[PDB]
Design an enzyme around this catalytic site. Structure first.
Site, mmCIF file in Angstrom:
data_model
loop_
_atom_site.group_PDB
_atom_site.id
_atom_site.type_symbol
_atom_site.label_atom_id
_atom_site.label_comp_id
_atom_site.label_asym_id
_atom_site.label_seq_id
_atom_site.Cartn_x
_atom_site.Cartn_y
_atom_site.Cartn_z
ATOM 1 N N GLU A 142 47.358 32.740 39.411
ATOM 2 C CA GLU A 142 46.393 31.831 38.803
ATOM 3 C C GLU A 142 46.289 30.534 39.596
ATOM 4 O O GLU A 142 45.201 29.964 39.732
ATOM 5 C CB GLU A 142 46.789 31.550 37.353
ATOM 6 C CG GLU A 142 45.714 30.856 36.534
ATOM 7 C CD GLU A 142 46.287 30.044 35.392
ATOM 8 O OE1 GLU A 142 46.968 30.632 34.526
ATOM 9 O OE2 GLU A 142 46.059 28.817 35.361
ATOM 10 N N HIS A 143 47.415 30.052 40.127
ATOM 11 C CA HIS A 143 47.396 28.818 40.904
ATOM 12 C C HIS A 143 46.682 29.000 42.238
ATOM 13 O O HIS A 143 46.138 28.033 42.782
ATOM 14 C CB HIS A 143 48.825 28.328 41.129
ATOM 15 C CG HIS A 143 49.390 27.570 39.970
ATOM 16 N ND1 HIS A 143 49.144 26.229 39.766
ATOM 17 C CD2 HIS A 143 50.178 27.968 38.944
ATOM 18 C CE1 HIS A 143 49.765 25.832 38.670
ATOM 19 N NE2 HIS A 143 50.398 26.868 38.151
ATOM 20 N N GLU A 175 55.124 21.350 36.959
ATOM 21 C CA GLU A 175 54.466 21.705 35.707
ATOM 22 C C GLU A 175 55.454 22.283 34.704
ATOM 23 O O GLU A 175 55.303 22.075 33.495
ATOM 24 C CB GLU A 175 53.338 22.699 35.972
ATOM 25 C CG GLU A 175 52.118 22.081 36.626
ATOM 26 C CD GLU A 175 50.986 23.070 36.794
ATOM 27 O OE1 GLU A 175 51.115 24.211 36.305
ATOM 28 O OE2 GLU A 175 49.964 22.704 37.410
#
Ligand SMILES: CCCCCCCCCCCCCCCCCC(=O)OC[C@H](COP(=O)([O-])OCC(O)COP(=O)([O-])OC[C@@H](COC(=O)CCCCCCCCCCCCCCCCC)OC(=O)CCCCCCCCCCCCCCCCC)OC(=O)CCCCCCCCCCCCCCCCC
Ligand SMILES: CCCCCCCCCCCCCCCCCC(=O)OC[C@H](COP(=O)([O-])OCC(O)COP(=O)([O-])OC[C@@H](COC(=O)CCCCCCCCCCCCCCCCC)OC(=O)CCCCCCCCCCCCCCCCC)OC(=O)CCCCCCCCCCCCCCCCC
Ligand SMILES: CCCCCCCCCCCCCCCCCC(=O)OC[C@H](COP(=O)([O-])OCC(O)COP(=O)([O-])OC[C@@H](COC(=O)CCCCCCCCCCCCCCCCC)OC(=O)CCCCCCCCCCCCCCCCC)OC(=O)CCCCCCCCCCCCCCCCC
Ligand SMILES: COC1=C(OC)C(=O)C(C/C=C(\C)CC/C=C(/C)CC/C=C(\C)CC/C=C(\C)CC/C=C(/C)CC/C=C(\C)CC/C=C(/C)CC/C=C(\C)CC/C=C(\C)CCC=C(C)C)=C(C)C1=O
Ligand SMILES: CCCCCCCCCCCCCCCCCC(=O)OC[C@H](COP(=O)(O)OCCN)OC(=O)CCCCCCCCCCCCCCCCC
Ligand SMILES: CCCCCCCCCCCCCCCCCC(=O)OC[C@H](COP(=O)(O)OCCN)OC(=O)CCCCCCCCCCCCCCCCC
Ligand code: HEM
Ligand code: HEM
Ligand code: HEM
Lengths: 422, 48, 55, 446, 106, 52, 53, 32, 55
Positions: free
Chosen positions: D60-61, D137
């Site tokens: 996703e990143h 994160e």
């Protein structure tokens, strides 16, 4: 299904504006928009509006507090009170078959409020809870300081009650504000699932209430002061605003295009805004986390265009200098054509995407009806937004550079500049 | 366009008998999570 | 330094019930029989105990 | 003019159409000048092992960091010059990439979308940058308390199962991944017919089908070596996890019992029950002895700050429970009231409460679907969950079948005398022991 | 309406009022009512001045009862000067309870 | 009393009736067992044997 | 009056069973019960009426 | 970092019917 | 509504004394002879009471 319907406008002799649309959605929505806001208070009474919007659930002469909540809860509907310095908006949602019930409450709460003093006293401590939750996010405290730093009298009034007034708001002040600001001519009513003709006769009841015009405010004057805070947080916030155009003017559109040229809003998630000029200017200034974008707040009396920069305490000065230097280059006439088109596309997509939701659409219609009373379709917005020329944007940038600035900055402030040296 | 809910200007405090109150506006935020580590600690005031 | 009848558990009960019990000031004699009842009980008990040693 | 069930019949229906490779294309047309186009994939952390726990999150990143045709910043420049919005999200059972844009740009959007799901460049330098970003994160998520207690609940309720581990994965695991495991994960999972294309708003199904064939038609549907990633059922465990940290302001309990899979009728009735209990907050207006029973009692001694009821559904299994916050000194009282409310529903349920629950459920269903993006999400999630899109008329019909007696039987089936799963993160010295919690799931009077 | 019966009703009520001794202590009628939860909330809604007056007159009555004394004749409360200050508040509280109970049964 | 009436209090009684019957049965059997009441017990197929 | 009735009951208990005592005892017993169960609530409501409660 | 937490194995204490991490527990709960 | 065992006077003492007072988790069987003593005391009363009906 039937043909796409249109919205009907009418203006009663009282001055009230009534607008209705007939879609075929199974959920109905009604809204009451009032020109009352935090800017209509004076120094004698302050925090009145902040307490007033919390009283929506209180008892009325025609309905008890118990009845209102239980009735709305059983039907499954909602009632909310959006507020801003210029306006206050009551809104209610329910199903098609229950409209006649809920409107009876909505009308009552705004026509025959009965501010029981003991109820008001018991509701007072809630003010602290609401205020604390809002200030949990530092952005709220920075702006409310920013408005208090750029305006002298009218728009400097905080949206939240000052600390010292929390225990001293009285029901008499609530009553006095209502009579002088809930006038019919100041109001507008909007409906989405309801039919127009029934809307006329339900609204006929309060034609014996209020009337005429209310108590006018004062034109907001500009000062240009600073308000620093010096809190212990590691991430310093700031603000750099200057006088702008007035809401609903040709110049106001140029400022809207200007901020979107400067990367006002992020689009792609987990991605650097390469097209944004400000992020590029800052990327080669700091190598630690930072956030930057442009600010735009247009009001009926005046507007404010500026910049907001979250950054590390040590790098605050460099971040601000880079952002300010970038604006100077734009004002000097260095502006490419492609950026204008890209920014305009961002504007139109944002406008249509925001109005797409029914709730926002009802909010936009109400806001427009109050000032003008004549809905302006989105296509007309597009023609207006496409008329912007490059020279207009250069003039807007030059005005911002030459104008006096107001700055509110919370954070460590060990290295943050001052006005008159920025 | 005359509603600030679709702009980056002032905030819009809201309240509701059943729903919770949350402010709005579009001034820079959120995009600081990717580059930074801004924690979200729970404090005296708690709301979902 | 503080009073010792506000720390010892056995004295807390006596302080609550007997010494620092808030009581209306205008109560008449009618409110005395309560105490007398207990007193009479305490008498009976002891009187009877001595009679039990020879019954 | 129109009744409720009469207005339900004016909602346009969704047109489905398969491609040769097995890709499902769905669309719901309207007169709006905007659209939302996205791809939903039946891939999540449930399909991962310890060696590749964080693969889904990591990809996703890198989804929008560049591709073979549009390297580097080319991808986001095109997206932003269009004024569109590119977004993504992940889960333990689904993944999605969707774009909000104008109908005038439907063609290009699909092209990019296809490019992002087939030609995802995985440059190594980017991998190093994402390593630190994910590491930071993860630190932020630690600050969030709700995430922490919801991950704990999964960890204890699915012990020894692939559903126990979190989407992000261990920190130690994200620092050792390579460009070979990511490619293996991508090749092994991202392919038709698992993908589902969806487009709600002002889009025509005919146009959506020709464009998909042009771009999405090239996706393979054959596994190498026939290494098919078969799914397996998940066991549920009644256990508790207690992470004590007195420095934190409030206790943060979370309880839940086992619940049906997404594809059983009973879940609908359970939703009604969750509407009776309701949610509470400190900012809500009125309600003091004026709202639902759990919230009316929630303000008599000022017990809770905010409680909510959830119903998480997975294939063949799910979680049903209630999450609440509370002060250090009032932990046990809040739990006592909550358990009483559940038992009352199991034994004494009036129709008046049920009618309120049904009305609330109708409002949530209709109001949630407002907007294009929620509609597109529903299409994608339903096509990967049920294989169809239940229309509103069907939802109303099933809800109308609900009755006080029905709620009693179903709640007794899942709530009564069942072993719960508990998670608590905060000052939790007052939290009652499991035995006391387990003894509060039944009534000696019943 | 009935005049002679009404005057007889007024006369007997005045006689009963004088027979009750609370006027002898300066007490108003509303001070003697038994304090149930409804009365407790009603008192909580009183303005400060009436609440302060009520407390002082109760103290004086208790003080007089302490020594078995009686207030002078001239200071006795009169049947026509009394104000039923607590009636509106108590009525509203009772009505609210009835509404809650009526809703609660259906 | 008047508040106790209403459509729902009737429903609450209906739901709890089965439980009331069972509890009443439990008490009756318990009383008979505790008291060794020959009158009822004599009609029990196996327990009756106890009685010589 | 109720107290006096109790005194009569006590006095009757101390006397032999005979015509006058038996009838008096019956009258005292019925008067006892009626006063508590009937008269007291009725007069209480009456007093509430003369006070315009 | 809280994602690094995982429950230790209890296999030496679990009952026979729940010893497999793939079979559902609902089919034995009533029996146990 | 909160539990009644934390509001009724008689139930407060019972809750404090028996139901909810914190205790060490590791106390061994030696800590079980205190409760037995009272039980024995109870047993010694009732039996003796019946014996007193005939002695
Ligand atoms: C208190 C009463 C409970 C008594 C408990 C123990 C009783 C022993 C006792 O006699 O002394 C306590 C008790 C003290 O009463 P208190 O606490 O001072 O006043 C509250 C009374 O309940 C009520 O007092 P009040 O002032 O509010 O009510 C008026 C009452 C006032 O009663 C009195 O004034 C009697 C007490 C006078 C002072 C006593 C101490 C000095 C002598 O008037 C009467 O008693 C007259 C009733 C009819 C008498 C008929 C002719 C009898 C000759 O004495 C009496 O009440 C006497 C009862 C027998 C009747 C005597 C009638 C006068 C002779
Ligand atoms: C013949 C069959 C008769 C069945 C009558 C059922 C009456 C149910 C009832 O109204 O209260 C529930 C009852 C408590 O009765 P309550 O204290 O008078 O409360 C009256 C209200 O219901 C208010 O209830 P609540 O607010 O207290 O909450 C219900 C329940 C909630 O449960 C709890 O929180 C208690 C947890 C600890 C229980 C064990 C205590 C130590 C033993 O409360 C209790 O269980 C309190 C138990 C205190 C026992 C006294 C202390 C130990 C000696 O607790 C039950 O769950 C049912 C127990 C029935 C036992 C039947 C045994 C037949 C042999
Ligand atoms: C509860 C009250 C129970 C009182 C009656 C139980 C005995 C039944 C009886 O006497 O015949 C009546 C009748 C015939 O029963 P039966 O089994 O043919 O007679 C057996 C005799 O007890 C046989 O009498 P026995 O002379 O041949 O042998 C001595 C016998 C006789 O001793 C007694 O009956 C002692 C009675 C003391 C009861 C009061 C204790 C609590 C105060 O004592 C025993 O062997 C133990 C049985 C007595 C009950 C002990 C368990 C009580 C707990 O029994 C009943 O109706 C039971 C009454 C229970 C329902 C309440 C009805 C009220 C309306
Ligand atoms: C390890 O952790 C633990 C702790 O640390 C956390 C603890 O702290 C504790 C708590 C500590 C303990 C128990 C230890 C001891 C401590 C205590 C506080 C309790 C102290 C004990 C006591 C006072 C003793 C209590 C009582 C005892 C034995 C009972 C004696 C008294 C009585 C009422 C009992 C009943 C006797 C009865 C009924 C008689 C039997 C006869 C019956 C049927 C026939 C009766 C007939 C009649 C009266 C007939 C009357 C007829 C009349 C008038 C005729 C009427 C005629 C008419 C016509 C009307 C524990 C257990 C623990 O484990
Ligand atoms: C010997 C005394 C100790 C053993 C018997 C009492 C006992 O076991 O206590 C627990 C029992 C059941 O109650 P429990 O399940 O713990 O919680 C309340 C219900 N929710 O509570 C009971 O008292 C059960 C027996 C009375 C019914
Ligand atoms: C006389 C009393 C004897 C009590 C002890 C009985 C033997 C040991 C029971 C035990 O260890 O508990 C585990 C429990 C019962 O054993 P279970 O798995 O049902 O079958 C075993 C077949 N060898 O395992 C279960 O599944 C029962 C679940 C409760
Ligand atoms: C049999 C032995 C009794 C003893 C040892 C006893 C003990 C007491 C005591 C010492 C008081 C305080 C007195 C006061 O403050 O006025 C009292 C008050 C009271 N007693 Fe008893 N009493 C007994 C019997 C009774 C009986 C049979 C009743 C019947 C109703 C009763 C009802 C009351 C009441 C209602 C109060 C409170 C009075 C008030 O609040 O003004 N008592 N008791
Ligand atoms: C409220 C408590 C008590 C009351 C009301 C009470 C009452 C009485 C009465 C009225 C008598 C008969 C008196 C007579 O016939 O002249 C009596 C006798 C007796 N009582 Fe009690 N009593 C009480 C407590 C006790 C206690 C605690 C004992 C403990 C030993 C006891 C032991 C006796 C004895 C031994 C007798 C025999 C009297 C005799 O031999 O003349 N009493 N009691
Ligand atoms: C902790 C409490 C008690 C203890 C340790 C205790 C101990 C004893 C002992 C050791 C005996 C000698 C019995 C024998 O050698 O046969 C005895 C006898 C007796 N006690 Fe208890 N006792 C207690 C309580 C009571 C009570 C409460 C009563 C009456 C209310 C009572 C009444 C009797 C009687 C009647 C006897 C004569 C029994 C006989 O002669 O065998 N005792 N007691």
């Amino acid at each position: 299904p039937p043909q796409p319907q249109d919205l009907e406008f009418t203006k009663l002799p009282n001055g009230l504006v009534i607008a209705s649309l007939e879609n075929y959605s199974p959920v109905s929505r009604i809204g009451l928009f009032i020109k009352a806001g935090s800017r209509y208070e004076d120094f004698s009474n302050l925090g009145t509006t902040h307490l007033l919007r919390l009283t929506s659930s209180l008892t009325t002469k025609g309905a008890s507090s118990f009845k209102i909540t239980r009735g709305i809860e059983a039907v499954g509907g909602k009632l909310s009170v959006t507020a801003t310095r210029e306006n206050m908006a009551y809104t209610v949602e329910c199903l098609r078959g229950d409209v006649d019930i809920l409107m009876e409450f909505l009308l009552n709460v705004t026509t025959a409020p009965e501010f029981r003093r003991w109820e008001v006293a018991d509701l007072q401590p809630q003010l602290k809870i609401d205020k604390a939750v809002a200030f949990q996010n530092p952005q709220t405290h920075v702006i409310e300081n920013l408005h208090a730093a750029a305006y002298r009298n009218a728009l400097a009034n905080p949206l939240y009650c000052p600390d010292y007034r929390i225990g001293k708001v009285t029901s008499e002040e609530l009553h006095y504000f209502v009579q002088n600001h809930f006038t019919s001519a100041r109001m507008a009513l909007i409906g989405l699932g309801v039919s127009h003709p029934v809307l006329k006769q339900v609204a006929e009841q309060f034609l014996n209430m209020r009337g005429g015009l209310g108590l006018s405010g004062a034109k907001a004057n500009y000062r240009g002061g600073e308000i620093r805070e010096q809190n212990g947080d590691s991430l310093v916030h700031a603000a750099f605003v200057a006088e702008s155009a007035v809401a609903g003017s040709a110049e106001a559109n140029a400022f809207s295009v200007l901020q979107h040229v400067l990367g006002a809003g992020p689009h792609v998630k987990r991605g650097s805004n390469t097209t944004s000029h400000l992020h590029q200017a800052v990327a080669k200034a700091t190598q630690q986390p930072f956030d930057v974008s442009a600010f735009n707040a247009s009001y009926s009396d005046s507007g404010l265009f500026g910049i907001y920069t979250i950054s590390q305490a040590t790098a605050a000065g460099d971040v601000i200098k880079a952002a300010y230097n970038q604006v100077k280059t734009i004002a000097q006439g260095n502006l490419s054509n492609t950026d204008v088109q890209a920014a305009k596309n961002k504007l139109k997509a944002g406008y249509l995407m925001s109005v797409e939701s029914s709730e926002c659409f009802l909010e936009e219609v109400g806001s427009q009806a109050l000032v003008a009373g004549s809905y302006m379709p989105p296509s007309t917005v597009l023609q207006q937004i496409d008329s912007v020329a490059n020279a207009d944007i250069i003039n807007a940038a030059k005005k911002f550079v030459s104008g006096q600035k107001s700055m509110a900055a919370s954070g460590n402030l060990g290295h943050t500049p001052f006005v008159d040296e920025l | 366009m005359l509603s600030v809910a679709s702009r980056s200007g002032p905030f819009a405090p809201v309240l509701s008998a059943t729903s919770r109150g949350v402010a709005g506006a579009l001034r820079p935020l959120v995009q600081a999570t990717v580059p930074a580590t801004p924690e979200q600690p729970v404090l005296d005031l708690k709301r979902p | 330094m503080t009073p010792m009848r506000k720390t010892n558990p056995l004295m807390k009960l006596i302080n609550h019930s007997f010494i620092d019990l808030p009581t209306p000031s205008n109560i008449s004699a009618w409110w005395n029989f309560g105490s007398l009842l207990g007193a009479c009980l305490i008498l009976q008990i002891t009187t009877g105990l001595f009679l039990a040693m020879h019954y | 003019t129109a009744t409720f069930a009469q207005a339900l019949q004016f909602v346009p229906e969704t047109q489905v159409s398969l491609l040769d490779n097995g890709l499902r294309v769905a669309s719901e047309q309207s007169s709006q000048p905007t659209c939302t186009v996205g791809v939903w994939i039946d891939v999540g952390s449930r399909f991962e092992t310890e060696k590749n726990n964080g693969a889904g999150y990591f990809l996703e990143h890198l989804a929008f960091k560049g591709t073979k045709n549009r390297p580097g910043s080319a991808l986001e420049k095109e997206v932003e010059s269009m004024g569109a919005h590119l977004n993504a999200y992940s889960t333990r059972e689904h993944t999605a990439y969707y774009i909000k844009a104008l109908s005038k740009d439907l063609p290009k959007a699909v092209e990019l979308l296809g490019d992002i799901v087939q030609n995802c460049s995985l440059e190594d330098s980017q991998i190093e940058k994402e390593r630190d970003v994910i590491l930071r994160e993860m630190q932020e998520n630690d600050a969030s308390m709700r995430d922490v207690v919801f991950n704990y609940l999964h960890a204890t309720a699915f012990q020894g199962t692939p559903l126990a581990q979190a989407v992000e994965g261990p920190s130690e695991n994200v620092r050792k991944l390579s460009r070979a495991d990511l490619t293996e994960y991508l090749s092994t999972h991202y392919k038709a017919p698992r993908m589902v294309l969806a487009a709600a708003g002002g889009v025509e199904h005919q146009q959506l089908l020709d464009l998909a064939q042009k771009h999405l038609g090239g996706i393979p549907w054959t596994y190498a070596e026939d290494a098919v990633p078969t799914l397996t059922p998940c066991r549920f465990t009644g256990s508790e996890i207690r992470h004590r940290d007195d420095a934190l302001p409030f206790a943060h309990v979370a309880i839940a019992v086992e619940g049906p899979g997404w594809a059983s009728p009973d879940n609908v009735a359970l939703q009604v029950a969750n509407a009776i209990i309701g949610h509470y907050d400190c900012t809500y207006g009125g309600g003091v002895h004026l709202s639902s029973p759990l919230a009316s009692g929630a303000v008599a001694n000022k017990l809770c700050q905010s409680f909510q009821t959830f119903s998480i559904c997975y294939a063949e299994t799910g979680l049903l429970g209630a999450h609440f916050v509370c002060d250090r000194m009032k932990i046990d009282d809040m739990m006592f009231v909550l358990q009483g409310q559940w038992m009352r529903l199991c034994t004494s349920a009036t129709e008046s409460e049920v009618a309120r629950g049904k009305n609330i459920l109708r409002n949530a269903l209709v109001s949630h679907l407002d907007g294009t993006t929620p509609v597109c999400e529903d299409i994608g999630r339903s096509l990967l969950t049920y294989g169809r899109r239940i229309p509103l008329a069907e939802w109303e019909s099933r809800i109308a079948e609900v009755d006080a007696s029905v709620v009693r039987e179903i709640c007794s089936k899942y709530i009564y005398d069942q072993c719960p799963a508990v998670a608590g993160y905060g000052p939790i010295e007052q939290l009652p022991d499991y035995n006391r919690i387990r003894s509060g799931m039944f009534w000696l009077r019943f | 309406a009935v005049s002679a019966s009404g005057k007889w009703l007024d006369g007997i009520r005045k006689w009963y009022y004088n027979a009750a001794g609370f006027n002898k202590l300066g007490l108003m009628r509303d001070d003697t009512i038994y304090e149930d939860e409804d009365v407790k909330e009603a008192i909580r809604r009183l303005p400060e001045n009436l609440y302060n007056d009520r407390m002082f007159r109760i103290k004086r009555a208790l003080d007089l009862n302490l020594k078995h004394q009686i207030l002078p004749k001239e200071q006795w409360t009169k049947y026509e000067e009394e104000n039923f200050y607590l009636e509106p508040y108590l009525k509203e509280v009772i009505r609210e309870r009835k509404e809650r109970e009526e809703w609660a049964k259906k | 009393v008047t508040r106790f009436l209403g459509p729902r209090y009737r429903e609450l009684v209906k739901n709890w009736v089965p439980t009331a019957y069972t509890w009443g049965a439990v008490g009756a059997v318990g009383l008979v067992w505790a008291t060794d009441w020959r009158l009822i017990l004599d009609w029990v197929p196996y327990i009756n044997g106890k009685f010589k | 009056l109720l107290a006096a009735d109790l005194l009569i009951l006590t006095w009757i208990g101390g006397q032999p069973v005979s015509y006058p005592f038996t009838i008096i005892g019956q009258v005292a017993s019925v008067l006892y019960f009626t006063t508590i169960l009937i008269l007291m609530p009725t007069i209480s409501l009456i007093e509430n009426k003369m006070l315009k409660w | 970092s809280h994602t690094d937490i995982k429950v230790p194995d209890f296999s030496e204490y679990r009952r026979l019917e729940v010893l497999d991490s793939t079979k559902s527990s609902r089919e034995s709960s009533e029996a146990r």
